Amino acid sequence: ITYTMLLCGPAGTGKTAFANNLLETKIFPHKYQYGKSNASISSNPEVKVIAPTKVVSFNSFDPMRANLEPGITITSTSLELGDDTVFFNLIMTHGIGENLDDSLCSEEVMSYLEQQFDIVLAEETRIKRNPRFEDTRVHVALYFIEPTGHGLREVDVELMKSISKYTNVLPIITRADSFTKEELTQFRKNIMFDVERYNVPIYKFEDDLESMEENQALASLQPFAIITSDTRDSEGRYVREYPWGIISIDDDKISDLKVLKNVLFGSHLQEFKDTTQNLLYENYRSEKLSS
Amino acid sequence: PPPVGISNLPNQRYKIVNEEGGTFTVMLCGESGLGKTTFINTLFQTVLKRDGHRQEPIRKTVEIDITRALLEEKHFELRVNVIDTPGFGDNVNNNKAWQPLVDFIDDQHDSYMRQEQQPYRTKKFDLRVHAVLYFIRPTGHGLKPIDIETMKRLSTRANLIPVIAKADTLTAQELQQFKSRIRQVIEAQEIRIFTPPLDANPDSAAVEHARQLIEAMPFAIVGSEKKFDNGQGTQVVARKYPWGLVEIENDSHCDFRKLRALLLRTYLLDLISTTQEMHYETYRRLRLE
Amino acid sequence: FQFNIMVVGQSGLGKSTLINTLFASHLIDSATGDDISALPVTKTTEMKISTHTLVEDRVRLNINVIDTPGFGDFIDNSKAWEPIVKYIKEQHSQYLRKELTAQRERFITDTRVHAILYFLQPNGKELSRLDVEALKRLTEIANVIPVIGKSDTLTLDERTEFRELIQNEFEKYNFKIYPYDSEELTDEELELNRSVRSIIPFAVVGSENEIEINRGRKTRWSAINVEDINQCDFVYLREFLIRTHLQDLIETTSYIHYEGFRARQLIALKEN
Amino acid sequence: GYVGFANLPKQWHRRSIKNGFSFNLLCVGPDGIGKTTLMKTLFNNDDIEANLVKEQRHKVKIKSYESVIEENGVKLNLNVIDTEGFGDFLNNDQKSWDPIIKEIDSRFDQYLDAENKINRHSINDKRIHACLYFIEPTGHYLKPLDLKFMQSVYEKCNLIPVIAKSDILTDEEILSFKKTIMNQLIQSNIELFKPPIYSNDDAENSHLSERLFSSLPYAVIGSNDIVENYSGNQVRGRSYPWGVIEVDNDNHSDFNLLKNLLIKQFMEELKERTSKILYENYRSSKL
Ligand SMILES: Nc1nc2c(ncn2[C@@H]2O[C@H](COP(=O)(O)OP(=O)(O)O)[C@@H](O)[C@H]2O)c(=O)[nH]1
Ligand SMILES: Nc1nc2c(ncn2[C@@H]2O[C@H](COP(=O)(O)OP(=O)(O)O)[C@@H](O)[C@H]2O)c(=O)[nH]1
Ligand SMILES: Nc1nc2c(ncn2[C@@H]2O[C@H](COP(=O)(O)OP(=O)(O)O)[C@@H](O)[C@H]2O)c(=O)[nH]1
Ligand SMILES: Nc1nc2c(ncn2[C@@H]2O[C@H](COP(=O)(O)OP(=O)(O)O)[C@@H](O)[C@H]2O)c(=O)[nH]1
């Protein structure tokens, strides 16, 4: 299958580390410590680099130019993680939250999603159509919530709404180690209250008794709080290390990351794909045809 | 052969200083969720501030709120003026968000100047900010354009003390790298940050502590209003996570005690004197050009 | 006989007490008092003359203690010696009026200034404007015997140096201080005059109150005897102005100063 | 715990010792009253007046001398003003003693001018922080000129009246002269500096302050030279053919009380009053 996932959030959330952990391959480099390798060959047997990292959109360490605003930059890195063979193109946003005005960033991301929708529509409405054409539509999208502990900001809400317009959007609390149990609970409650207040159309984990129970539990879990590291233990366990203690990404209580990974690449992958392909895209196409 | 009381003049000065009382003014700049309220509640051992102001319109207007209190420790009274920056950096468009804060500092300086313009001037209401703590989110990446320009704008109005918020969030190597990047940026951008006075000293250890303090910038701040046992029978103020406990009073875990030395314990008088002899003087000169 | 002794100084110098002690009775009470309102009403130095009778030596003497209240006691003492000079010369004019009068009397009372005691403050500095002018105009108008008030204010060496300084000041201003050496005097007389002259300006300490130990002032760290020779010159001045030169003083006030004023006044009358 | 914001006064103590101190003192009196001996004994420096700083006379002469006196590390920059000619004139009118007042006003003027400059660069305080008037030990009453000058100066400078050469006057004489002088001062409305009593301070130190106020006018003596006591103990003072007076002995003089009120105890408070009350009144007048 051809799966497409977007990772959007303010700079300093942990999207690069999250992607490296998910792939089990350090295919994405962290900013300012990069250029040693960016789209290198995978260190994972299942991970393949079918296309290096490349920019799909642009709108704009050097200490003298640190003041300069980066703008927004959207990059799609294509990989093949394996019938089971999945062609997974990961889109990522950089420079979001690193400028004064972030309206440009929201505009660019929404425009990229809309242009992919339009490309698919044009292929569909073609006298000679390529039946196996590669769709660039973002089947799922994860928005990283900066660990404020208070609630959702303005840029957070607007970006999540923009992403929701064209793809499913999932609220993901990042760096949950920054929060204690009570603090993380309160932060999650605040996030849910704010999305309800502003009516952000965040994705809902809402035919089988067990399936209904799992959906209910996953909905109660959201926003998903996760700890991610691209560094591993000598034994080979992705872990964070602090002077007061060492965190393991595998630990269930520390991170909901493995539930999130299961839903993203396992259970609900097809659900995200079908909803983005046959509900959002179809409604957009109907509106265009009415235009 | 009797002595003169030249050696007692300093003890007289001490007597008047301790019987008069002091006033400290600190502006805590940053975004929402940088452990600022908890920091000021931890530095003074008391709850000077609150629970967040929240559930209001998402587009926050950068305002200035001053929380004033009278604190007594050893029969010495201090008027603490904790100035805040609600809504700063919490919006999609944060352009010209540094204007209100620098404007407030300039307004306080002008107020003091106009108190001097009084014909028969009396006791002085001095709200000039003796310290400015700019909190940086622990992104572990670098300083944002908003951050650098606000800091540079307010670095001439008063004293600037960069601090890395929620420094426990970052791992040791990550926080050290973040500190190095911040120092390089503020060195290239030429931002001016308060440095403890080590000169170039009779108390070689005091200027040595000055050196230790200036080699620990931007300061790592870990603040908690709850205390936990360390396992040896001693309760230390700390942040309790299941993997480990981040004690605020251990120099190995945070630079909070260094910041307390700079702000209240060791270099508080120096901060006040620099704010009143260097910054205010330049503002007054330019205002009276 | 009638003797006229005048005291010239400021309030405090200790002149009233000095007279009181030199005569052994309370003759003159401080004319200045302890009130700034007791000072003269003319805002110029005034004269207080008091006549007492002292016959304890069986030499009955009619003392006339004269005092100059107001001297150096106001802010403007620009003419604080003019009234003193006027008093002296008027007392002289009375005697010459009686002697120039037809069918005069046998005893034409001598109210002239037989002796003057100018009290020099124990400051250790040269003569001030007031002191200089007053001594300049009073040395040739009457017999002046310098004295140093509150000589307790100067240690022995300090007192000696100040006395030498005052002696040199007298010589510089050409001031004529009593006694006066003459040719009639014998050798013993000349040497006595030299000695009392070396004592001048005197350093006298006066106390009308008596102290008990084992006449003087007794304090916390000190105890002076007004009649001690190795402590003060009070005995010397006493003997000098009461016995040694008293006769010479009263004779020179009638032979030198009075006859001088007589010649001057009569010459002026002749001319006019 | 203990947040260390009560440590600020200690930082002030250290700053003070580091930056030394400065005291401008005025001495008005007759020539020969003992204002050159008292100063040297107060500052234990025989050369306290050897750094002279930068058709008949009819006005007193104001002489400025600047020295430095350091004890146990702390250093003080003393600037003593001496009047020369007070009383020596036979006029002694307001013009005679005007130069002293003009000099005090000039110090205040320089301070005000530098405070009101655009550059407002570091200014050195020359304002007269105290005025010692030496009162002769006549034993009768405060003299007219003394009253006039002390009233003319009681607002410009802190007033510290003393009775000079007090060793001559007997104990009872000193008491009576002190009482008369104080009565004359109060009825001329001449006001003297009252030592402050700090709060949360020792009650003994408060009693010392009260005694310092109620011992005025003082009775001070000066002799930096050493004389032998009747006990065989060398002591600072003066030796006469009748006895020996000791400058450091409290039983003999209020010298130690004056040193307390002028240097040891309330020098800083005197400077504070001069720079916070008197100078601001001068500024209001200039305004
Ligand atoms: N405390 C904490 N730090 C994290 C976590 N994940 C990543 N980081 C660190 O935070 C930074 C994340 O930067 P990066 O993932 O490149 O962020 P992006 O630019 O927003 O995509 C790096 O310094 C990571 O080492 C996490 O779960 N917790
Ligand atoms: N990682 C970390 N989180 C902290 C720390 N102190 C407080 N917090 C979290 O941040 C919250 C307090 O933020 P607050 O001080 O109100 O925010 P600000 O004043 O707007 O920066 C707490 O409820 C915690 O969840 C700290 O030292 N480290
Ligand atoms: N120390 C000292 N005091 C003296 C001396 N003579 C007088 N006094 C004091 O001077 C004070 C005033 O003297 P007094 O003769 O009454 O006054 P005057 O006539 O106005 O100068 C008295 O209280 C005496 O105690 C002296 O030789 N030494
Ligand atoms: N009796 C007495 N004489 C003193 C005292 N202090 C100083 N003197 C003498 O007073 C004289 C004048 O003092 P000085 O300091 O030279 O005077 P200034 O011209 O006022 O500076 C000196 O020769 C000292 O011997 C004192 O307490 N008592």
Author numbering:
A (entry chain D): 22 to 81, 92 to 113, 126 to 249, 255 to 339
B (entry chain C): 12 to 61, 63 to 64, 67 to 214, 225 to 313
C (entry chain A): 31 to 244, 249 to 306
D (entry chain B): 98 to 151, 177 to 409
The authors write:
They are cytoskeletal guanine nucleotide-binding proteins that belong to the superclass of P-loop NTPases.
G-interfaces are formed between Shs1 and Cdc12 as well as between Cdc3 and Cdc10. Cdc12 and Cdc3 are connected by a NC-interface. All subunits contain GDP without a coordinated Mg2+ ion. Cdc10 lacks the α0-helix in our expression construct, explaining the tetrameric nature of the complex. The switch 1 loop of Shs1 is longer than in the other canonical septins and is – except Shs1H51 and Shs1K52 - not in contact with the nucleotide. Instead, it snuggles along the surface of the Shs1 subunit where it folds into an interrupted β-strand between V68 and N80 which is attached to the β2-strand of the central β-sheet. All septins possess a highly conserved arginine in the SUE β-meander (Arg(βb)), representing the central element of an overall conserved interaction hub in the nucleotide-binding pocket.
